[PDB]
Amino acid sequence: ILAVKKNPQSPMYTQLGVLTKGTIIEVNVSELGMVTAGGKVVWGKYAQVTNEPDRDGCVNAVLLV
Amino acid sequence: MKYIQTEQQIEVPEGVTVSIKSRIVKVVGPRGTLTKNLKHIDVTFTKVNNQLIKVAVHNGGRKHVAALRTVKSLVDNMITGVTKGYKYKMRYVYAHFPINVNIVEKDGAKFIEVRNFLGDKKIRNVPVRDGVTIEFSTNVKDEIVLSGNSVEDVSQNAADLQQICRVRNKDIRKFLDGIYVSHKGFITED
Amino acid sequence: MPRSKRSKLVTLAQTDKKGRENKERIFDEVREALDTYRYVWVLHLDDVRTPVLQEIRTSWAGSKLIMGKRKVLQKALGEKREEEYKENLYQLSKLCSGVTGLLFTDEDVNTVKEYFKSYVRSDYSRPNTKAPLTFTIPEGIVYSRGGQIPAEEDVPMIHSLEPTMRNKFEIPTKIKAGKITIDSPYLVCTEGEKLDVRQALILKQFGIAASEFKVKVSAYYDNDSSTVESTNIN
Amino acid sequence: VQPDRRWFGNTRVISQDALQHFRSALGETQKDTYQVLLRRNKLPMSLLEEKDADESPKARILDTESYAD
Amino acid sequence: AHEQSKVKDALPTYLLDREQKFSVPLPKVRGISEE
Amino acid sequence: AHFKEYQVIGRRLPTESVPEPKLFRMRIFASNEVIAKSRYWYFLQKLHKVKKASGEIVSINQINEAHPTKVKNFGVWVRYDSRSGTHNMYKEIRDVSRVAAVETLYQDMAARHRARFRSIHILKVAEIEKTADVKRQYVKQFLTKDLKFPLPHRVQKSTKTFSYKRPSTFY
RNA sequence: GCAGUCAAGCGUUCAUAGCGACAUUGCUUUUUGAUUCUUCGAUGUCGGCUCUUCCUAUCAUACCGAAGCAGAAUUCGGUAAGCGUUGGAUUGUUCACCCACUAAUAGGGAGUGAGCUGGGUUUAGACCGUCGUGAGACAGGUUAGUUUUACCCUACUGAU
RNA sequence: AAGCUCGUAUCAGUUUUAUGAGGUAAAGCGAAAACUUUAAAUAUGUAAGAAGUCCUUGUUUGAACGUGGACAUUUGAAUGAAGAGCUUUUAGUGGGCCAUUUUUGGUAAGCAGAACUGGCGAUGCGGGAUGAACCGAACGUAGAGUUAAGGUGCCGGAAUACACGCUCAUCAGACACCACAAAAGGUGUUAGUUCAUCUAGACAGCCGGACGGUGGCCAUGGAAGUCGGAAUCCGCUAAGGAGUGUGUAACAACUCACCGGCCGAAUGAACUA
């Protein structure tokens, strides 16, 4: 992970860095080898967390494309 | 489905006489007499002509009609017992320790003594039943023959003889000693 | 029997039931060939090794041999006088009893009635006949073929078929070192005896073909005269 | 969460010139024992690693003869 | 399967023979109080 | 109850441009006449779009049995909505009149399929005129030549509270 | 857990609007048993004697079933609670782990401040540390750290 | 109530009619579903005579506005009937649970917020073994009769009544209940639906056939239908798989898949309750 871009239900929790369900986070995607038009190399994108990671350990997220 | 009537037939040969009071069946044949007590089965007996006896159940269910062919078969077994008799043939095998079998009377009781089973020192006795005669068949080493009028005595005695010699705590793939039933036929033959 | 009933056994094989169309096609073929030849015999071949049957077939590629359900052949011919394709047929249709059996041909009667007179093969007892021999199993190692060859050329019987002879064929056997052994004289059949079911099996186990099988005839029909002639050959 | 065109927009691209520059500037470190780190300048680090080896690790034998073979 | 066994995307030569709006997927999740 | 069978003839109300409607008729099984009228209106409204409010009952009579003392076999056809998806059903009843056959069918449906009077719809009661057309075995087993059987075993009725005889279920 | 694939049925009739059991793939670090020297914030109470009794979700003892079960020793299961289920070392913490003996050292409930006490109750004191301009408060730390009845009615135990 | 001006044929937690509103088809039918031509309600507003009709027409003929007479009580739908309105002020009260009916929003599952309507508090009595919310029910003192809800083997007043079915449970069942484990598993039993086989003979049993190219190809010590891999074809038939299991080091041997012989009338599968 690289940042917590936006957490619903408050901006204070976005500041504190909380990872509840629905949070939007920024992940490093150099392992997927994405190239943009003009030939640059993406290494950071947005994903949404899709579980309550207080009822397990994993944080599960879906990329935003 | 509660049929109005179910029925079976028992055919009687030309030597034997069956006589049925309330439900105490008695068959007398060219070989002896046999009695059975069917008062727990709830059927109606009827004689037709000295060679045929019909058994019937009036308005009976599935479990009640199941117990009808079994009565037919018990009476048939009694008839074939008093005409042909039964002979079971058992055999014992061994690897190292010879099974030594004998008939011994213990105060007028006729036990069967089995010694040296797998080297054991216990003397297993099996009490012969009253009505079944036992003898060791010649011309065949290790062969014991039981015969009689009743099946439920010959077969039970054979079962006791077979189950008295189990092999506890050993591989029953490697250890083959025992006494097993070889054949179940009639005295006549042929 | 809403419950507590016999669960039938399903099995995964390639072939399928033949159905009604096979009976219909056979009953059509016999009737539409009935008016292509002239002589229609009937045969009684009960226990026929299929290679022998095929030899009989190929002994002439000019005449057709038909085999099928007995009642189907009857339904082709006609049961009562009041139904039949051709005329006077019932008088041979009322005769076919066993595994019949219908031979179409385009040949004189005598050649066929002598071909079926001079034919016989060697085979097994096919039980409930008479036992035409008297052999005893020797009293040592029971060899594969039974003991009626030079025993020093034979290989001892395999171990895997001891329980058959010990349970089903009712023969007192024991198992020493891998050879199967017997110690008492044994009698299978007495020559001149009605053979019950077990003796034919015990005999066929030792591969001694000692039975004459000849095809037999019971009736016959000629078309251009249209009247049956029942001649018995055995 | 409202809809927006950010979120479905790239955020952290990098170019080949920067990649080659940074990759060439990782074999010229010359650590000083008296300099201490203050910040690290977040970079895509899995693309600038992987010095050359000479080993070529073992092949998977399980893809040909699993175990029942 | 047995019963059916009676009657009955453009990859290169080296890639065959091998194998393997602006809304967000989760709007309006439940709310969590400060307690 | 003790059922009866009625014939109910109803009709839509008159109106200009539509005088003299077409006089529909039904046979209904019920215990009295009010229930028969109710069932008539229910079945009309269910069949198509006629309403008690817009129709009228032309007549309602009772239908007796023509030969109430001759044993007969009937086939009954029923449809009922309980509990899940409905289903039709054909039964055979050997009795003496259409009313009693229906009564025993209702008691039997209640005993078995947890069914009540407003879930059941009699579609047809038809006499099986020709023997060997009967299907069900529990009826077929009463049509054999020279039928005889004894009464159920081991039953007996008493009124005294103390007896001096140790009874016999004669037999 | 999340994202998919499948496909018996269900769903008013219905695949394709929809659900959808059983099966299945993606990965949370390294294919050669190499040592992984994580041991990372419990805000509230466990831990231990004396003594009964109950549950079975069985460690041992009795009897059975299955295993490449040759013998010996084992492993996985069935009935079964009749009987038993230990001695010590460790607070620069013991919500544990060690080494012995043994047939075996199973898991729990009723617990338990009137039958006993350890950290932890807080107090009367005092000092050190942090904070506060100060009186003082605490992120702390150390030391100090009293509860006794029945002689009443019942229950239990014995006695007239 | 203090009290007084007023029971004035006017009022009403009600229906009917006229009409708006839901407009959902579920009327019901279209000019090539594509309506609005139009229901039946579901509770939803308003209106239904004396402060009303006509004659006659002066001002800012149609708009309000002034005027001088005609108009009668079955005087303008149904049901019930005498308890609505000001003034004085005078006593208590001013914050809450259960359930049903709509509506909105909800997640592991609960539920949460609005509104109507009953119960309770202030309230006894009959029934549910026992109960504030469950079923009945108009509280002076007594006599007699008939019942509600619940019941009727004994406790316990009242049929060990009558009629038709189902059920055997080594913790049956007799439930605030139609929510929770609840979808399935069972060779327990009973009824039903849909498909098939069948006197040119079914299902179960015995007995016979189960063949030829061919020990098909690649494999390798040996692999002949049966350790494995790729096809899975041809001929002859009534039928017979380049083979469903047992078996051999390889074979042989037995077996079913499929045919036929003996016997003789009903049988099988899936599915629902």
Alpha carbon dihedral E9, E13, E15, E16, in 10-degree steps, equals 60
Q: How far is the CA of C18 from the C1' of G123 (A)?
A: 103
Phi, psi of C28 (to 5 degrees): -80, -40
CATH T-level assignment (fold) for domain F2-68: Ubiquitin-like (UB roll) (3.10.20)
Which tokens sit at B40?
Answer: 């727990």
**Radius of gyration, CA atoms only, chain D:** 21
Question: According to DSSP H, which parts of B17-171 are helical?
Answer: 62-84, 151-163
Helix (H, G, I), strand (E, B) or coil at B189: coil
Could you check: is the Cβ of residue C167 within 7 Å of any atom of nucleic acid strand H? no
Could you say which DSSP state residue B148 is in?
E
Measure the CA–CA gap between B34 and B12, rounded to whole angstroms.
15
Round to a whole number and report the distance in Å from the CA of C164 to the C1' of H191.
Answer: 49
How far is the C-alpha of B112 from the C-alpha of B179, rounded, in Å?
A: 13
Distance CA A34, CA D14 (A): 11
Side chain identity at residue C182, one-letter code: I
Q: Determine if residue B59 is left, alpha or beta; phi over 0 gives left, psi from -120 to 50 gives alpha, anything else beta.
A: left
Contact across the interface for A9 and E31, Cβ inside 8 Å: yes
Characterize the bridge pairing of strands B100-104 and B111-115.
Answer: antiparallel
CA-closest candidate to residue F74, choices F119, F37, F14, F129 = F129
Contact A18/E at CB under 8 A: no
State how far the Cα of C16 lies from the Cα of B116, in Å rounded to an integer: 59
- Token representation of residue F15: 């109106």
Which tokens in the block code for residue C70?
């007995």
For B60, residues 6+ apart whose C-beta sits below 8 A from its C-beta are B2, B3, B6, B68
Task: Return the sign of the alpha-carbon dihedral for residues F118, F124, F130, F133.
Answer: negative
Optimal mutation site among D12, D22, D40, D46, interface A, most CBs of chain A within 10 A: D12
Amino acid C17 reads K
Q: What does CATH list as the number for B1-85?
A: 3.90.930.12
- Reading the block at residue B85, the tokens are 């008799």
Domains B1-85 and B86-190 are alike in CATH topology = yes
Q: Which of residues 33-62 of A touch strand G (CB under 7 A)?
A: 50-51, 56-58, 60, 62
With 0-12 CB in 10 A as exposed, 13-18 as middle and 19+ as buried, what is F154? exposed
Tokens 């002589």 identify what position? C39
- Surface of A (13-52) touching D: CB under 8 A: 22, 24, 26, 28, 30-31, 36, 39-46
Backbone interruptions in chain F following residues (C to N > 2.5 Å): none
B5: enclosing H helix or E strand: strand B3-11
How far apart (Å, rounded) are the C-alpha atoms in residues C46 and C211? 14
Task: Output phi, psi for B187, to 5 deg.
Answer: -70, -35
**Cross-chain Cβ contact B4/F150 below 8 Å:** no
| Architecture, CATH, for domain F69-145 | Roll (3.10)
Query: For residues B168-177, b (16+ Cβ closer than 10 Å) or e, as one string?
Result: eeeeeeeeeb
B73 vs F136: CA distance, rounded Å: 32
**Rounded Cα gap, residues F39 and F94, in angstroms:** 26
Instruction: Let me know how long chain E is.
Output: 35
Find the helix or strand (DSSP H, E) in which B28 lies.
Answer: strand B24-28
End-to-end CA distance of chain A: 17
Tell me whether residues B140 and C172 touch, CB distance under 8 A.
yes
Q: C17: number of CA atoms within 13 Å, CB side?
A: 2
Nearest CA in chain D to A36: D13
CA distance C138 to C129: 25
Q: Which residues pair with F87 in a beta bridge?
A: F80
Question: Is the bond preceding residue F171 a cis peptide, omega within 30 degrees?
Answer: yes
* Rounded Cα gap, residues B151 and B185, in angstroms: 11
Q: Give the Cα separation of C206 and F29 in Å (integer).
A: 80
DSSP for residue C152? G
**What 3 state SS string does chain F have?**
CCCEEEEEEEEECCECCECCCCCEEEEEEECCHHHHHHHHHHHHHHHCCCCHHHEEEEEEEECCCCCCCCCEEEEEEEEECCCCCCEEEEEEEEECCHHHHHHHHHHHHHHHHCCCCCCEEEEEEEECCCCCCCCCHHHHCCCCCCCCCCCCCCCCCCCCCCCCCCCCCCC
Q: Determine D/A contact with 3+ CB pairs under 8 A as the test.
A: yes
H helices of chain C, in order, are: 20-33, 50-58, 70-77, 90-93, 109-115, 162-163, 197-204
SS3 B100: strand
Nucleotides on strand H lying under 7 Å from protein C-beta = 26-28, 40-41, 106-108, 162-166, 186-194, 197-201, 204, 206-212, 236-241, 243-244, 247-248, 251-254, 256-262, 268-269, 272-273
Tell me the HSE value of C52 on the side-chain side, using a 13 A CA sphere: 14
List the resolution, Å.
3.1
Tell me the CA end-to-end span of chain E in Å, nearest whole number. 58
**What is the spatial distance, in angstroms and rounded to an integer, between the CA atom of E8 and the C1' atom of G9?**
25
| Domain spans in chain B, listed from the N-terminal domain onward | 1-85, 86-190
Integer Cα distance of F121 and F29 in angstroms: 10
In chain A, DSSP assigns E strands to 3-6, 24-27, 41-42, 45-49, 61-63
**Tokens representing B105?**
């009377």
- F19–chain B Cβ distance below 8 A for any pair: no
Q: Which residues contact D11 (CB under 8 A, 6 or more apart)?
A: A26, A44, A45, A46
In whole angstroms, what separates CA F162 from the centre of its chain? 44
Q: How far is the CA of F18 from the C1' of H30 (A)?
A: 21
Distance CA C120, CA C102 (A): 19
φ, ψ of residue B115 to 5 degrees: the values are -115, 150
Is 3.40.50.720 the CATH classification of the domain at B86-190? Answer: no
Cβ separation F149–B3 shorter than 8 A: no
Q: Are B114 and B164 in contact (CB under 8 A)?
A: yes
Distances in whole angstroms, Cα of residue C225 to Cα of each of C41, C43, C87, C108, C167: 14, 21, 10, 14, 59
From the list B140, B53, B46, the residue with the least C-alpha distance to B91 is: B140
From the Cβ of B173, is strand G under 7 Å away? yes
Domain ranges of chain F: 2-68, 69-145
Which chain B residues are Cβ-neighbours of F150 within 8 angstroms? 58
Biggest alpha carbon–alpha carbon distance for chain C: 72
Is C33 in a helix, a strand, or coil? helix
**Residues β-bridged to residue B52:** B11
Compute CA F136 distance to the chain's CA centroid, rounded to the nearest angstrom.
18
Most B CBs within 10 Å, among C174, C182, C196, to test the B interface: C174
Please tell me the distance in Å from E8's CA to the nearest CA on chain A.
41
Instruction: Tell me the chain D residues in contact with residue E26 when contact means C-beta distances shorter than 8 Å.
Output: 1
For residues F157 and F169, give the distance between their C-alpha atoms in angstroms, rounded to a whole number. 10
Tell me if C146 sits within 8 A of C208, measured CB to CB.
yes
- Chain B residues in contact with F138 by the CB 8 A cut-off are 1-2
Is D40's Cβ below 8 Å from some Cβ in A?
A: no
d(CA A63, CA A42): 13
F141 touches chain B (CB under 8 A): yes
Q: How many CB atoms lie within 10 A of CB C43?
A: 21
**Would you state the structure tokens that stand for residue B188, as one six-digit string?**
């006549």
Residue C188's Cβ-count burial label (10 Å; 0-12, 13-18, 19+) is buried
- Total length of chain A: 65
Token pair for residue F153?
Answer: 């075993």
**DSSP sequence for C82-141:** T--SSSSTHHHHTT--SS--EEEE-S-HHHHHHHTTS--EEE---SSSB-----EE-SSB
CA–CA min distance E27, chain D (Å)? 5
How many CB atoms sit inside 10 A of residue B87's CB?
A: 18
Closest of A20, A11, A25, A54 to residue E31, by C-alpha: A20
C109: its two tokens: 């009667």
Asked if E24 has any chain D CB less than 8 Å from its own CB, the reply is yes
DSSP state of B174: T
Q: Positive or negative, the Cα torsion across C89, C90, C95, C96?
A: positive
- Nearest beta carbon to residue B139 from set C170, C174, C184: C184
F contact test, residue of B1, B2, B3, B4 with most F CBs within 10 A: B4
Instruction: Tell me how far apart the alpha carbons of residues F105 and F93 are, in angstroms, rounded to a whole number.
Output: 8
β-sheet with F55-62: strand ranges across: F24-30, F4-12, F55-62
d(CA B44, CA F24): 59
Q: How far apart are CA B164 and CA A23, in angstroms?
A: 76
